[PDB]
Symmetry: D3
Subunit: 144 residues, 6 copies
């Protein structure tokens, strides 16, 4: 239920968006819990991007080294956050378009059920149905 | 003068803006010092929102539970910040349009005086005057 | 039916003032008002204000912007639009009736439960907004 | 050659859904698709969707937006454009050939190594993307 | 008096380069230049560049953009504008004279103390910018 | 290689962009390692700016006091981040347009070389060449 997460950041005013899209995908294949970009505004009228990576506290060296190798930054800053995470498991749910996996999260008496995006998007593509139509059909089916 | 503040964050790529506007207002009625949204850019070409909540360090359970109940997130991250806060009190200031409350903040020999928005906005609405006209009239009156 | 778009960049106004003008503009009958974060000269974080409205409301919306913001001028233009046909359905849920906007286009049909109904009933019955939103989707499903 | 721009503001759709529609629109032949973060009424963080495309693809791109997003209508307009002349050069590097887009305008000449080639070879040879990008610049220099 | 707007999306240029082009464009006589953060294909954080200027400066501003940025083309259009009447007042403060822009529209009258004067005197007299700005408002009040 | 950095933040919904551009430059002349702005979305439909300042851990009082004097904020929050920084030195590199300084950063066996912006921008201005043309000429020359 309770763990910790490492957050690593770096500001980039000297790298292309092309290069940043590449490193986002390098970081996820490296096992980062999450990667995101925040538009920031830096000195000398430069539009810039802040890179944030969340990962296991023990992955400090891995993620740091990846960032210094693949981005233009000279340094990284990092710090540990505490976390509260719900318990999670999966249910196979039958819908009008086929089976969809649904993540079931519980925390004390809080409970929510989230259809898997990739499952819904594949079925929307296959059957030429809007993604939102399939996702909602999965939500109805979850209501069971 | 010196205290600490708890910061709680969560990234949301699976929730509507409608839902986020609702939770912002749920969080403030719950006693959060501040709530804000930051546009971020997440994996799989998803535009997302980071939710940040500042509050009392002792409100960890309250604010965490509210977020997990009202948002789609599976976990939250949180951490404690130190703070330096000016001393604050209120003055009733008479202006050409009626009384306006002004927050007077002092820190060592730093001092600034901030007219209350709601007081100025009500009077601008009532008398059909631009908000900035009333706010500046309150700033002049503060100069006393 | 065409729409008027009015824009103005603001680097010399507080956020407090901008929240005020959004609500003045909405009560004046603007179709929509939104802010876009921009970055302007001399290292200024700024905001672009966009107002969408009826073309015949050009003078009203212009006047409010020039009165309530710091901008010296506004720029405007008309956009053509394509709008789906729209009607509303009221659906019964365990929490009361919820109106659902039903939009159609050619062979498109989609359903957006009304925000005001889901939020009102969510507060009233002390349940998450998503709980009421989903019950309206279930109710629609029959 | 003119370009069509289509816009729609979305405060009632998930990011997951928006990533899906960007890829539907790109596979439909849109020139470009991008998102702009906006701030809408009632404290809603929102996204503006912009689609750039061929003017003759107006009905296709409109239909996809109204089918796959939550918007009730779209607004559109045509922009004039000025486009540089463009050709491609293949340059030999220690990692293989890399195509380079060469754009010219009057007396302007500039070189952008092709992203797909630099990324493919960077993964293949386990070197940073910038390492391959720079080697293509060196290769261009002779 | 109408205004020209030129746009271009950039996912393949550094921020360093973009700060350079903003200052080239301003010295070339652009009315305004600003950046808007956008999100483009293939998970790229990007920047939209907007240039506002005189319609007769279309070719100059286009040439600078195609020379100094990575974009292959630009899109442009003309917006109509409504501009308030404007004049300037010099007001005496404890820190020197400060020019105040006075803008009027119908029965609107508003006052924006000039940034360059408040900033120059704030540095000169080692006081906050807001302190000089407010003293100009007081000075205006009589 | 390994140090720490102090991060100070403040949200501003009651200050002009003009005022923020001024304080960014006040902060850099004060010796901040970095200053940046993040657009955020605050209560009551206010578009706002978050101010972030990175600096030496021992500059807490300096940077705090500057912010409370020059911005509208009533308080600041701050916290210490750990950092991993590459070793850095400078090389004078001869290019087709004159000498350009290049920062050479190394970390274990990671190495990258970054031409100085001001050197390239001056030469682009002087010789009426695009900045990107000069910067790339410096990158080629670095490849040595
Ligand atoms: N910051 C995060 C985000 C992810 N997770 C965990 O890692 C998994 C990945 O989250 P998710 O968004 O579901 O990843 P994917 O399934 O790969 O992608 P998608 O968003 O399409 O579902 C989740 O189960 C979550 O519990 C985490 O620990 N920390
Ligand atoms: N991050 C924050 C922001 C607020 N405050 C305190 O909480 C009060 C709320 O701040 P304020 O913005 O003034 O709230 P309101 O008065 O409700 O709204 P408004 O902005 O319109 O004045 C302030 O006095 C401030 O001292 C705080 O401790 N931490
Ligand atoms: N860009 C827009 C936005 C709105 N409208 C018109 O304005 C009405 C109000 O729009 P909406 O945002 O839905 O207002 P509410 O329903 O009050 O807000 P909510 O999103 O909470 O449902 C719409 O039905 C539509 O007719 C429009 O024509 N063009
Ligand atoms: N605003 C735009 C964007 C694209 N195009 C056309 O679409 C093509 C594809 O654009 P691009 O972004 O370069 O696609 P890719 O080359 O596939 O992507 P990448 O950036 O990775 O090279 C361009 O050559 C151009 O002819 C256009 O006319 N107008
Ligand atoms: N969108 C714009 C912006 C500027 N201008 C013209 O350009 C002049 C310069 O604009 P401004 O931003 O005020 O320049 P400065 O006064 O130099 O900058 P500052 O904001 O620091 O006062 C204005 O007076 C106006 O005539 C314009 O016509 N259209
Ligand atoms: N957050 C940061 C950023 C800067 N630095 C250090 O401070 C110096 C300033 O960084 P840089 O961006 O190179 O500053 P300038 O050279 O002044 O400006 P420019 O970006 O144009 O090179 C760098 O050498 C870097 O090592 C730092 O310690 N912490
Ligand atoms: Cl750092
Ligand atoms: Cl997290
Ligand atoms: Cl304008
Ligand atoms: Cl726009
Ligand atoms: Cl519209
Ligand atoms: Cl274009
Ligand atoms: Cl705070
Ligand atoms: Mn730098
Ligand atoms: Mn099955
Ligand atoms: Mn998943
Ligand atoms: Mn997810
Ligand atoms: Mn009284
Ligand atoms: Mn207050
Ligand atoms: Mn100005
Ligand atoms: Mn509605
Ligand atoms: Mn009740
Ligand atoms: Mn709506
Ligand atoms: Mn290409
Ligand atoms: Mn391999
Ligand atoms: Mn491209
Ligand atoms: Mn001026
Ligand atoms: Mn001095
Ligand atoms: Mn406030
Ligand atoms: Mn020499
Ligand atoms: Mn430098």
């Amino acid at each position: 239920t309770a763990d910790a997460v490492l957050m690593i950041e770096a500001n980039l005013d000297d790298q292309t968006g092309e290069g940043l899209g590449y490193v986002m995908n390098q970081l996820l294949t490296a096992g980062a819990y999450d990667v995101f970009f925040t538009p920031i505004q830096m000195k000398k009228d430069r539009p810039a991007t802040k890179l944030t990576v969340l990962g296991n506290v023990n992955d400090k060296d891995l993620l740091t080294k990846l960032i210094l190798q693949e981005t233009t930054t000279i340094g990284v800053r990092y710090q540990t956050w505490q976390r509260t995470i719900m318990q999670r498991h999966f249910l196979t749910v039958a819908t009008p378009y086929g089976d969809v996996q649904v993540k079931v999260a519980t925390y004390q008496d809080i409970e929510k059920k989230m259809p898997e995006y990739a499952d819904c998007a594949q079925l929307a593509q296959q059957f030429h149905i809007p993604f939102r139509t399939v996702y909602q059909a999965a939500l109805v089916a979850v209501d069971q």
